[PDB]
């Protein structure tokens, strides 16, 4: 298949919560997709396994992928440093959209976020590159651990991840 499928098994203070799978839109944003794909398999020797969702704001989104510093200050792409916004074709149309976190234009690393509502005001600013396929309810359960400022009440981890399909 042109579009890969990846999974995250999510844990809460080490206890399994469930599985969330995502379709990656390699047919629209191949480079961004292959970054997340590769980070999810650990095939380069590094990636998401064991990292945490360090910022969750209920009603807005769940943000993770800082596997080097665990707090929003790190992360790294498979490209050997931050990479350009591939395009802004896909919109943040509702819950389950997967999109690249960034600190300004052309600074994509490994941090990403899963929308839990429509987030129109991000369009043109964050590259959308996938959607949740199974397990939206797991994402919604994750929002129960967040707060207005994003600090989480419990340690939300990707206990395992990889590719499916």
């Amino acid at each position: 298949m042109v579009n890969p499928t990846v999974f995250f098994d999510i844990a809460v203070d080490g206890e399994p919560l469930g599985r969330v799978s995502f379709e990656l839109f390699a047919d629209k944003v191949p480079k961004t997709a292959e970054n997340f794909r590769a980070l999810s398999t650990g095939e380069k020797g590094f990636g998401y396994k064991g990292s945490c969702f360090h910022r969750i704001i209920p009603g807005f989104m769940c943000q993770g992928g800082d596997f080097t510093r665990h707090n929003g200050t790190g992360g790294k792409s498979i490209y050997g440093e931050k990479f350009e916004d591939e395009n802004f074709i896909l919109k943040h149309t509702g819950p389950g959209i997967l999109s690249m976190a960034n600190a300004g234009p052309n600074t994509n690393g490994s941090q990403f976020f899963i929308c839990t509502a429509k987030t129109e005001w991000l369009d043109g600013k964050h590259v959308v590159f996938g959607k949740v396929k199974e397990g939206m309810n797991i994402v919604e359960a994750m929002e129960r651990f967040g707060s207005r400022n994003g600090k989480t009440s419990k340690k939300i981890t990707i206990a395992d991840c990889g590719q499916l399909e």
Partner: protein
Amino acid sequence: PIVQNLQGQMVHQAISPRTLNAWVKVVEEKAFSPEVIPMFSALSEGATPQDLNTMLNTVGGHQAAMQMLKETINEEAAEWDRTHPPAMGPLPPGQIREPRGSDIAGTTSTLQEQIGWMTHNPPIPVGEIYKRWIILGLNKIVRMYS
């Protein structure tokens, strides 16, 4: 400027032509003498960066000075940027973008923006930051010319 409304909450007012005219006259009288510095601060109470810009941009003459001031400012902005890594997005609903160095100096920000930062809870004090940079540039001008 942003002024304290005696019923609560900070409010914006249009730049004051009187305040302006008093600054302009300070500048025509005293030719970059050290007393300009406290006067600048005395007349820029609650100023937005756009207000400060208007105050500086109206000083007729002294183009060399004004351009040396610009350079101190643009320097200070660049430095601020280099010392404050941009906060990670995505931006939460209801939040305004954080100000960079060029935003604080009012060169890439709108008045609406500057209003929003300075009136936010708590205020993000772009006018006071800028004002410190401007004072630093004034120091340099007073040392050149006096």
